[PDB]
Each structure stands twice: as C-alpha cells, then as structure tokens.
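Our collaborator T.R. sent over the components below with a one-line note: 'Predict the complex.' Nothing else. No constraints on interfaces, no templates requested, no preferences about which chain binds where. So this is a plain run: every listed entity goes in together, and whatever single assembly comes back becomes the starting point for the next discussion.
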Amino acid sequence: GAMGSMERASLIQKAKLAEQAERYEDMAAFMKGAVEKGEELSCEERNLLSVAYKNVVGGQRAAWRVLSSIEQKSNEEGSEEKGPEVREYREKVETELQGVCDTVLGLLDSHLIKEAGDAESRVFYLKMKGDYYRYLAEVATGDDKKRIIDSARSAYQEAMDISKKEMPPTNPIRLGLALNFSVFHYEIANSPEEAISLAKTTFDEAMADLHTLSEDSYKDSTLIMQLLRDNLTLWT
Amino acid sequence: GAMGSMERASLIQKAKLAEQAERYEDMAAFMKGAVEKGEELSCEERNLLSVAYKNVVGGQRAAWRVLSSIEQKSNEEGSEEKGPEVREYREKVETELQGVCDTVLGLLDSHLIKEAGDAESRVFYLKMKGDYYRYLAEVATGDDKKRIIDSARSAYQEAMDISKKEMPPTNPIRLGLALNFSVFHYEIANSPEEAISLAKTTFDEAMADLHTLSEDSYKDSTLIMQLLRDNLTLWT
Amino acid sequence: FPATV
Amino acid sequence: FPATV
Ligand SMILES: Cc1cc(C(=N)N)sc1-c1ccccc1
Ligand SMILES: Cc1cc(C(=N)N)sc1-c1ccccc1
Ligand SMILES: [Mg+2]
Ligand SMILES: [Mg+2]
Ligand SMILES: [Mg+2]
Ligand SMILES: [Mg+2]
Ligand SMILES: [Mg+2]
Ligand SMILES: [Mg+2]
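Returned assembly:
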C-alpha cells in the first residue's frame, strides 16, 4: 500500500483537503489508506470514504454511458463501420470501473463489514456493498451477471432488515438505503412495481415520524424524502 | 510509451471519444501517443492536443489554488498549527502539475516546434510553450523562477512576432495568443500596463479587420475579442 | 437517471 | 481569474 507509511490522522486530514480541492481520486486513495490501517471508521470517516468513491465511480459511470451509447449507434443498421476502437475504449473504461468497484468491495470484505456491529455502521457498509454490486451489474453481460445482481440484492436486503429493526424510519442512512434499493429494483431487477412500492412506503413512514425530529434532523430527512418523491414522479 | 502499439488513427479517434466522455486525462494520453508517432499534426489534431492538456492542467491549477489558499491561512498569525499535511499535499499536486507541464513542453521540444514551418502551426505551438511555462511560473519559487518567466516571455514573443508578420489581426490563434500573453503580463510579469495596452491594441486592430470576414469567421474572432474586453473590464 | 445517494 | 484560451 502506497499509503502504508502515512499516519492515519494525516490520511484523514488529506482526504478532507482533497475534497475541498475536488480531487476525488486522491481523496479515495487517502481513505483506502485509512481503512487499511485496520481500525474501525467513525461516522465522519465513513462518509469521507463514501463521498470519495461515489465521485470517482460516478465519473466512470457517466463516461461508460456516453461510450456505450456511441457504441450502440455504431452497431445499428446502416451505420458505417468505424473499427474496434469504440468497443475497445468502452471496455477500457469498463475495466477501470470494475476495478474501482472491486476495490471498494474488497475494503468492505476485508474487514469493514465483519467488524461493524452498530446499526449505523453496519447498515452503511451493507448499503455500500449493494451500491457497488449495482454498479457492477450496470455493466455486466456474462455468465455471472445474475449472481452479481443477486449479490447486490442480498446486501441491500440485509441492510434493510437491520434498518427496520434498529433505526427510526426518518434515519437518513435508512432513507438513502431505501432510495437506492428502490432504484436497484427499477433499473437492475426489472421490478418497477417493487421500486415504486418501496419508495412510497418509505416516504410515508418517514413523513409520519418527522414530528419527533429537531429542525436539523428534519432538514436531513426531508432532503432524502424529496429524492424519493422525485423518483416517484419520474416513474408514475 | 504505453501507446506505442496503437495506430495513430486509432489514438486520434479515441481522443475524440475521450473528449465526448469528458475523460481528459485519457484524451491527453491518447494525444501524447499520437504526437510520439513522429508525424506533424493537422489543425484538428493540434486542437485535440491542446484541449486535452488544457483541461488536465486546468484542474490541477484549480486544486493547487485551493490548497495554496488553505496553506497561506494555516500560516497566518493566530492560526493553530495543523502539521505538515497541507504543505505536503499542496506539494504533491504541484509536482503532478509540473510533471504535466514538463510533458507538454517535452512534446513541443521533441519535436513539434522544430518541424512547424507554417504560421498556424508554429504560432500555435509557441503559444502553448508560453502557456505551459506560464503555468510553471504560477507555482515557481526557487532559483530558476526568473528563468521560467523569461522562457514563457520568449516563447510568447516569438509567437507574437510571427503572428504579426503572417496572420491577419482577426486570426483566432493570433487573438488567443495575445489574450494569453496579456494575462502573462498582468499576472506573472507584474506589468499590468503592458497587459492592458496589448489587450486594447489587439482588440482595436481586430475590430478594424472584421469587415473582411465571413459570418463563421466573424463569430470565431468576435468570441475571443469579447474575452479581451472582459479582461479589460476586470483590469480598468 | 433516477436519484441515488 | 482573467480569461485565457
Ligand atoms: C455526513 C458527513 C459528510 C462529510 C464530508 N463530505 N466531508 S463529514 C460528515 C460528518 C458526519 C458525522 C459527523 C461529522 C461530520
Ligand atoms: C478547432 C477544433 C476543436 C476540436 C475539438 N475540441 N475536438 S476539432 C477542431 C477543428 C479544427 C480544424 C478543423 C476541424 C476541426
Ligand atoms: Mg500510527
Ligand atoms: Mg468487459
Ligand atoms: Mg415490503
Ligand atoms: Mg501505423
Ligand atoms: Mg515544489
Ligand atoms: Mg507593442
């Protein structure tokens, strides 16, 4: 590990600096180094890890979608052959994306999840496992595609089960998990009705619990509730 | 060269795909590979090269400025010591930026400039040489700082001399060169009056030549003229 | 695309 | 910052 010689606290500090500088690849490398110190992560540290990799993989996904669209158009009837280059470059971006997902999943499996006993940490990591298997599923086409989808589903389901037992329905981790699992159902599992049902039930159960919250918690929860409503509007 | 096995035309095609996908680091690597094939670059290819590296170094410069500002605040009177991390990380970004500039300057010196005989190509490359020495000067503090500034000046001056002899005053390469050399004077050479004089004379001489142009050339030239006016408004 | 966090 | 191209 290229970060093995740097203090854990220095890695965390530099991750925060990298975030301010919008250097998300650096931020992800620093947080990977911090995880590899072997200690559990605090809530703030978990969010630095997730922000870093979400931005890295989000850029890769956006690029993959552009290239996939060009490739599909190059393969339509009447298109002029342009050679192997579009496929090759889409494959290059795809392989880099898969590498990032494998890296995150590797951190979760060695050993973040197994040491995470509190609901806030364990649900957060299982949500991340579902998300990164979901990103693998977006690009998957081979013998293992169904197993990739099922790995995402299984991680999301375990996170959901814990969240329903241990967290209030307005907890922002629980809300974001449900938002993302609902998107998994719509876009990956070809289950739009399940996606819509989950988003609606999540929104309504959160609504009914808002009365318990402070102003700041209310803002956190209603932000994610608005995303649930945005998706419901897109889908209905 | 990791691109040595890929056809020149394939590198150019992939650079264009990388641009569409906003993958500018890839786009720059592909164009470096294309330059290293040893053939001269067409106008379109020169612009792919410049777009790629401008975006890469522009991101590095933006990050360097954020980190430099944090570092300066950490060094003010009354600030709490935060350790070496801010300086270290600013230095890391700075070294990567210097590496990109050295790479571009190396391409220009081996062997783009020496083979560039037409004004459009030679002025373009000398402008790029001035620009990348200017980016080095923005971060320079050591024994060679004055020589870095003078290298930028010398490249810009040679480009200016050729452009005035060989190009009309509305030529967009000539306009962009003047815009950038004017910024060099203002921000690097501590010569704001020279910067303002150059921007004004460039704008006025272009204005007087617009009547010769087609609608499409008029659009190209007036776009850059507006940037000259924007800077003049910032500076006066 | 739909929203995720 | 001022404009450059
Ligand atoms: C939720 C969050 C996101 C953060 C970031 N993008 N840097 S820091 C952070 C947090 C969490 C818990 C306690 C204090 C700060
Ligand atoms: C000016 C320019 C920028 C380009 C780009 N960002 N891809 S291609 C291009 C050009 C130049 C000359 C002839 C045809 C195309
Ligand atoms: Mg230690
Ligand atoms: Mg593949
Ligand atoms: Mg249910
Ligand atoms: Mg060949
Ligand atoms: Mg240095
Ligand atoms: Mg003069």
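Summary for T.R.: The pocket of L1T (ligand 1) is lined by residues A 19, 43-44, 47-48, 51 (CB under 6 Å).
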